[PDB]
Amino acid sequence: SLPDLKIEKLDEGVYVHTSFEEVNGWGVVPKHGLVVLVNAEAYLIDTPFTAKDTEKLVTWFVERGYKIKGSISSHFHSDSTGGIEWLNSRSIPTYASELTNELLKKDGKVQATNSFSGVNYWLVKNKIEVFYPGPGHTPDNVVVWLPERKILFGGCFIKPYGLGNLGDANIEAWPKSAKLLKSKYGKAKLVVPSHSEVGDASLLKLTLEQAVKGLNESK
Ligand SMILES: CCOC(=O)[C@]1(CS)N[C@H](C(=O)O)C(C)(C)S1
Ligand SMILES: [Zn+2]
Ligand SMILES: [Zn+2]
Numbered sequence: 437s438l439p440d441l442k443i444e445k446l447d448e449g450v451y452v453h454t455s456f457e458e459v460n461g462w463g464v465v466p467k468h469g470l471v472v473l474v475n476a477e478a479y480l481i482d483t484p485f486t487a488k489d490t491e492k493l494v495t496w497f498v499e500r501g502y503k504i505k506g507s508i509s510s511h512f513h514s515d516s517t518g519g520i521e522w523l524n525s526r527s528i529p530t531y532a533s534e535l536t537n538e539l540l541k542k543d544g545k546v547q548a549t550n551s552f553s554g555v556n557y558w559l560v561k562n563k564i565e566v567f568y569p570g571p572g573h574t575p576d577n578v579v580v581w582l583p584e585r586k587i588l589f590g591g592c593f594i595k596p597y598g599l600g601n602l603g604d605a606n607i608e609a610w611p612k613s614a615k616l617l618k619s620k621y622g623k624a625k626l627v628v629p630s631h632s633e634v635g636d637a638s639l640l641k642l643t644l645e646q647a648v649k650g651l652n653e654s655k
Contacts, residue, residue, distance in 0.1 A: 438464060441489045443496055447585050449473040452628065453493050455484030457515065462601075467515040467630055470589050472582060473502060474563050480507035481564075481580050481589050482630070483519030490519025494528070504528050508559050508566060509548060510591035511577040512539035513604075515630065521546040531559060533568065535576040567620065569593065570613030571606035572647065579617065586625040588640075593617070594629035596642035599650045607654055610647035618644055 442454040451471040459465045469482030471493065478497045483490045494504050506529040509516040517540060520530045524546060532540070532548035540547045557566040565581040573592045580589040592600070593613070599605065618640040621627075627639040 439466075441484060441492050443471070443493065446470070446626070446628070446634065447587060450582065450585055450587060452634065453480075453484060453489075455486070455489045455515075457485040465515070465631065468628055468634075469516075469630075470580070470587075470628060471497060472564055474505075474560055476502060477505040478502040479505055479559065479564055480519075480523075482510050482516040482591065483507055483523065485515050485518045487519055487522035490522050494523075494526075506531055506550075506559070507548075508532065508564075508580065509536060510580065510589065510593075510630075511574045512536045512543070512545075513574065513592065514545070516591065517545065517548075520548055524549055533557075533566075533576055533578055536578075539574075539576055567617075569617040569620075570609055572610035572613040573600070574604045575606055579621075581621065581624075586623065587628065588621045588624040588626070589628045590617070590630070590639065590643070592630040594627060594632075594639050594643050595646050596629065596632055596635070596639050597646070599646055600631065602650070607647075607651050611644065611651055614640070614644040614647045 438456045446452045472479045508531040530548035531550045534551045534553040537547045537551045568578045577593045624637045
């Protein structure tokens, strides 16, 4: 038995959802995403691993009076996209980058119904921004920025204590992508990783250090 879906308030209008999955060779893996509230509407920043937990997460906010206006997935792995199929079946708009949707399609997985293409994209103008720092953990990984809270969801790109699975990684680009991320969000109040605890902007520095060290160790 895996731990249950957790939902925890992080800031005004910002909640961290944590789901858990058994991943062969990694044991029980936690995955953090966000739910962001704008007025009476809720946006999912990454879906939980599974449809079950995506439904639980949606139910919780609907029962509390928030309409689910959409989800955005930060990269194509199923810890960010596992609930897209279920959201689509409920006519809740799902978003992912063009490249993320291409990689879903290539793996025979359900795609988001909406795609965006380019370095920056406003999911909600002035409230929820999407930014592509370049390849790192995967070729498609993006981050999500909440300007009114100075909170950055770094997703599986933020790796403060070790890079993790390099199977889909672009280790030669990750240092550059990490330097770009740090220079753009160096003033973030909070940085939310997918697989470790929330921290401050130093998680940007630590990530860059881990990327540079990972590229060095591949000699
Ligand atoms: C489907 C299970 O796989 C995953 O969804 C991830 C996506 S990042 N794979 C990673 C890895 O293999 O290191 C992880 C940190 C274990 S979680
Ligand atoms: Zn991943
Ligand atoms: Zn991940």
